[PDB]
Design a protein around this ligand. Structure first.
Ligand SMILES: CC(=O)N[C@@H]1[C@@H](O)[C@H](O)[C@@H](CO)O[C@H]1O
Ligand SMILES: CC(=O)N[C@@H]1[C@@H](O)[C@H](O)[C@@H](CO)O[C@H]1O
Ligand SMILES: CC(=O)N[C@@H]1[C@@H](O)[C@H](O)[C@@H](CO)O[C@H]1O
Ligand SMILES: *[C@@H]1O[C@H](CO)[C@@H](O)[C@H](O)[C@H]1NC(C)=O
Ligand SMILES: *[C@@H]1O[C@H](CO)[C@@H](O)[C@H](O)[C@H]1NC(C)=O
Ligand SMILES: *[C@@H]1O[C@H](CO)[C@@H](O)[C@H](O)[C@H]1NC(C)=O
Ligand SMILES: *[C@@H]1O[C@H](CO)[C@@H](O)[C@H](O)[C@H]1NC(C)=O
Ligand SMILES: *[C@@H]1O[C@H](CO)[C@@H](O)[C@H](O)[C@H]1NC(C)=O
Ligand SMILES: *[C@@H]1O[C@H](CO)[C@@H](O)[C@H](O)[C@H]1NC(C)=O
Ligand SMILES: *[C@@H]1O[C@H](CO)[C@@H](O)[C@H](O)[C@H]1NC(C)=O
Ligand SMILES: *[C@@H]1O[C@H](CO)[C@@H](O)[C@H](O)[C@H]1NC(C)=O
Ligand SMILES: *[C@@H]1O[C@H](CO)[C@@H](O)[C@H](O)[C@H]1NC(C)=O
Ligand SMILES: *[C@@H]1O[C@H](CO)[C@@H](O)[C@H](O)[C@H]1NC(C)=O
Ligand SMILES: *[C@@H]1O[C@H](CO)[C@@H](O)[C@H](O)[C@H]1NC(C)=O
Ligand SMILES: *[C@@H]1O[C@H](CO)[C@@H](O)[C@H](O)[C@H]1NC(C)=O
Ligand SMILES: *[C@@H]1O[C@H](CO)[C@@H](O)[C@H](O)[C@H]1NC(C)=O
Ligand SMILES: *[C@@H]1O[C@H](CO)[C@@H](O)[C@H](O)[C@H]1NC(C)=O
Ligand SMILES: *[C@@H]1O[C@H](CO)[C@@H](O)[C@H](O)[C@H]1NC(C)=O
Lengths: 388, 388, 388
């Protein structure tokens, strides 16, 4: 890395974009003398499937059910130039519907504890809360706020003064709305993001078809000396086929659990709050995350702040005025090549250096690398104008 | 949840109360050819009890012994209108005494590693530190401060300006003192909070009585062919009785351990510091927690801040003055129906909007939802008065 | 602890020092009918060594490889009065070299996955980043800054206003440079800090020598009835000798792993960031930590802030002026025995109390313990001078 004792790097521009990521949460859960002894083995095989089945409902609850009472929104689409009408809530959202549309003989299939209706309700409650009130740390929602005022605090949390959001509100809203529209067409048109979920579904569709492809009709036709041989052979190979099936479900379940753990982590860290980690809940600095319902999983839309062009500015520890040293009240002192300004750290904002944004401590002989500039008050000009 | 693009919810009042909760920390720990073979089984049973016994002293140390050197207070009862004389330190506190007053044949009972005197010393040291100095993050106490100045920082930590404590110091102190008095009478009069500890004590009193109710006098009277039969039967049923006893102690010990883990968590999180989680160390926002000694456990008195009546105020992103946009320096802009004020976020405090509590950035054409108001300086009035 | 309702303890001076600690990270990893049955046992013994060998490279990566792309510095020695020329980068640093200079028959020794060159590169990248740019939270470096401006933020993080660093920059730099020079001579002269690493090295040097000290020459000379006896006895005792060796390596490996876990924790907590825990990454308040390469381990140089002399000042909640109560804008009000000043909390800095560093709320009848003083504005003096 390049370095210099008077060089400071400050971003001068930024963009906001919406990153879409899809995390699988749950897998389809299924169930299924010497004969009795085989029955014992069957039970153990079923137990393994049962343990998985519990885990799968285990996963669903950990990811979605982080709110205790369900909430719903009023018919508001415009939250300050921001278009939420295609993520909000069949009464499902238009985007969720895209995800839904695009993604015997002893063998039975179980229902989920949380059905599509319950999941839609939990997702709606989480989303309704995030947008209008915001969630607190501990339990429940916080207090109602318009919406830009919520974003303003998320900007402050990444070191950006609460004036950037409002000055660039039109640009931010347009970039947000554009990204949502692009996600609209992208998810439908190209099988990109919709990869992980389809893969999981295809795999057990295959596992089930394999299990199936792999007693009374024998007993009624064959005598004991032969019937027992055919029966024992069929039972053994079928138990082996089930063992293979169970093993495949267990391994895949482990991958789903790992994904569910991540989804739950993000839900509690950046959906119900804000992530401090960069490049975690989306590339760049996290501001907000809005959950969406999906087949066998959850989809997150991450709104992130990404800095752009950076410039090399000349800096100084402090400014000398009348022999006294003036230190910056909040920001740092930088030179644009002809004039000195005071700016915040994470975004170039050339404020004029005045006595109202500085404090006085020490002197010009003590401070190292101090520069000679003019730091003026807003009072004398008024005195000169008022009666002179 | 109801929502509106210009509606902000702000609390206008609050109350402070003391929540009492009781957490069990430790359980009474006890100990107890073919004959030798039974002896092996007895040893294994004793091992299980030994493992528990270690855990029980394990628990006590984790919860109470979080301070290395013992401290004591001066004879101060009044810490700024706050009455601490009935929680401070037989040299035990009057409240602790209420808790104390209200709550062979191979079988022996063990002493604790930390006796009542040692526990009283640790509790006194933790409490002495909390009240006068406050604890730091890492090791030891911080620096001596009166007391209201400690509370002031705990208020700041929940988003309330350090003026609320002082303006309402009389009301806060009265509510605190009242709560302690109520706890005084409540704990003594009604067997409510004093439930969990009594339950634990009663259970092993029963377990021990059961074990007891459930050799030489046989050998000296019966011949071998009969004596061995009676002896083997008695040993077997006694080993079974002990197995049941050990199992009961193990299960209960697990519940005690879970409770001890929670008590230790709270001790390090909200007693030696401040909890950020709402509704954890008491309902509402945590400010302080004072530990108290108790039979077989620890009692915490949590001082929490609870907001009350909320009003729906009309808000605006910024205020227009001379065509330039004025943004709030710290708080938000709200309207009470006739006038605009600037307040903090978590408590309604209608400060007059002046140039000294705002900053100027951008203009009235760019900001969305900007309102027309007057933002004035404190200088012109002085100029007009001084020489005009 | 002593206590009083109007006494506040404030530090008036400080020192900065460099604490050196050495943590071992990795251990030398090694490898090694009835005969075949013994071979099975040998394989199990080798497996245990293999598991250790994996762990040892496991440790190295966890501690050092926390940066993905390698970086190098420009030839800068002076970073603002701070001498870094003896810690920066044979192309190894002079201090690292001191550490390096001071610290068959079936038996083989394995190489590390990360060789000395790779470790030097990772260490250089971590150090290059720490000094010039500083690391961010999530991934990669942050933004380029001189260096004093980085320290200034680390001071702010411990409650000290960003003016202390600059006013005392000469004293801080001299204390830092002095400490590094002392470490220079200390590490070379006295076998103090260089204890843990030498101990680990000596122990397996001994383990290997012991293993060695503890077939065809028998078969070609002895007949079956005797040859088998000698051979079986030698194999058994050699397998026992190896079992002892493996056990010793496993136990020591556990100690190394515990140390590696700590080193990795510090690397991610206080090297790539800042520790909030006091007396963790060095005595006192942590500011910075610079890694250094070492034989079989890592060396950390911790730069810590230590407060010194404290005084007992008289304090007051607020100051009365014209019947209105004035509260401190940032700090606290203290009396030095003759005059009232406003200072920050963690360092005595007697600023003059003026209307520009206070705010007005409430009145002199409500506030408890309010004192009568003069709080003046900087305006009237200008009005009196300008035209009177
Ligand atoms: C790379 C980048 O961020 N470019 C933007 C540009 O698109 C935008 O028009 C301009 C508005 O001032 O800010 C900058
Ligand atoms: C619900 C509630 O907090 N009510 C209080 C009231 O008891 C108190 O007298 C008043 C003092 O201004 O503040 C409010
Ligand atoms: C214990 C201690 O910190 N003493 C220092 C002293 O060495 C230094 O000369 C002085 C400079 O003002 O500050 C103080
Ligand atoms: C949101 O986008 C839809 C198009 O999908 C459009 O019909 C609607 O008017 C937009 N609403 C706002 C507030 O922009
Ligand atoms: C800043 O300086 C570095 C080092 O010379 C250079 O690589 C970089 O491109 C410069 N940045 C700009 C915007 O010129
Ligand atoms: C610095 O900013 C001023 C505006 O205040 C501008 O006039 C000047 O040209 C800028 N200097 C450079 C080198 O861009
Ligand atoms: C920065 O480094 C240059 C040498 O390249 C030196 O002359 C100058 O005085 C240094 N300035 C500061 C503030 O250290
Ligand atoms: C500022 O001006 C004074 C003379 O008024 C001079 O002595 C001092 O060196 C100058 N400082 C700098 C950084 O040029
Ligand atoms: C505290 O309460 C007791 C009554 O239990 C009373 O006697 C004592 O005077 C009170 N002290 C203060 C400072 O209020
Ligand atoms: C604020 O508005 C909501 C929605 O209409 C209403 O339910 C609530 O009662 C109002 N609050 C007050 C104090 O009137
Ligand atoms: C708003 O506050 C002012 C006091 O500054 C008061 O006179 C006025 O009546 C209040 N308006 C309402 C609707 O309460
Ligand atoms: C708030 O919503 C109303 C529609 O109910 C609209 O007329 C008004 O312009 C919106 N104001 C803002 C700031 O969005
Ligand atoms: C403020 O007054 C100006 C005229 O001076 C007017 O053009 C502008 O629209 C007004 N703003 C609002 C929010 O009413
Ligand atoms: C750093 O110390 C070395 C002595 O080891 C000295 O030669 C060099 O000049 C010093 N550099 C600075 C900037 O002090
Ligand atoms: C502050 O007061 C305590 C209690 O009397 C005393 O022990 C301590 O030495 C005093 N500090 C100083 C610097 O005198
Ligand atoms: C308090 O500080 C002033 C300087 O503003 C000094 O003159 C005075 O002697 C100090 N008082 C004491 C007791 O040190
Ligand atoms: C401090 O305690 C003394 C008694 O030693 C009392 O007279 C004084 O009024 C108390 N001051 C405050 C602010 O509590
Ligand atoms: C301050 O002076 C007023 C008289 O102007 C007096 O009533 C009040 O008690 C004094 N306050 C203190 C703390 O001495």
């Amino acid at each position: 890395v390049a370095c210099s004792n008077n060089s400071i790097a400050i971003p001068t521009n930024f963009t906001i974009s919406v990153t879409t990521e899809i995390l699988p949460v749950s897998m389809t859960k299924t169930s299924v003398n010497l004969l009795l002894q085989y029955g014992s083995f069957c039970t153990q095989l079923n137990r393994a499937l049962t343990g998985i089945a519990v885990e799968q409902d285990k996963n669903t609850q950990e990811v979605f059910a982080q709110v205790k009472q369900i909430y719903k929104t009023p018919p508001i689409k415009d939250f300050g130039g921001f278009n939420f009408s295609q993520i909000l809530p069949s009464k499902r959202s238009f985007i969720e519907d895209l995800l839904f549309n695009k993604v015997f003989n002893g063998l039975t299939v179980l229902p989920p504890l949380l059905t599509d209706e319950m999941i839609a309700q939990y997702t709606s409650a989480l989303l309704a809360g995030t947008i209008c009130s915001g969630w607190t740390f501990g339990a429940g929602p916080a207090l109602q706020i318009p919406f830009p005022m919520q974003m303003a605090y998320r900007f402050n949390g990444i070191g950006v003064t609460q004036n950037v959001l409002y000055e660039n509100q039109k640009l931010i809203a347009n970039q947000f709305n554009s990204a949502i529209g692009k996600i609209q067409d992208s998810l439908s048109s190209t099988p990109s993001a919709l990869g992980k979920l389809q893969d999981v579904v295809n795999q057990n569709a295959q596992a089930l078809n394999t299990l199936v492809k792999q007693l009374n009709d024998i007993l009624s036709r064959l005598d004991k000396p032969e019937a027992e041989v055919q029966i024992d052979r069929l039972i053994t190979c079928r138990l082996q086929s089930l063992q293979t099936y169970v093993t495949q479900q267990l391994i895949r379940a482990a991958e789903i659990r790992a994904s569910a753990n991540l989804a739950a982590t993000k839900m509690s860290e950046c959906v119900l709050g804000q992530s401090k980690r960069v490049d975690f809940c989306g590339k760049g600095y996290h501001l907000m995350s809005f959950p969406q319902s999906a087949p066998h999983g959850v989809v997150f839309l991450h709104v992130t702040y990404v800095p752009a062009q950076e410039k090399n500015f000349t800096t100084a520890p402090a400014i000398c005025h009348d022999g006294k040293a003036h230190f910056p009240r909040e920001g740092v002192f930088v030179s644009n090549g002809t004039h000195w300004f005071v700016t915040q750290r994470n975004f170039y904002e050339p404020q004029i250096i005045t006595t109202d944004n500085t404090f006085v401590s020490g002197n010009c002989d003590v401070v190292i690398g101090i520069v000679n500039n003019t730091v003026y008050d807003p009072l004398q000009p008024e005195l000169d104008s008022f009666k002179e």
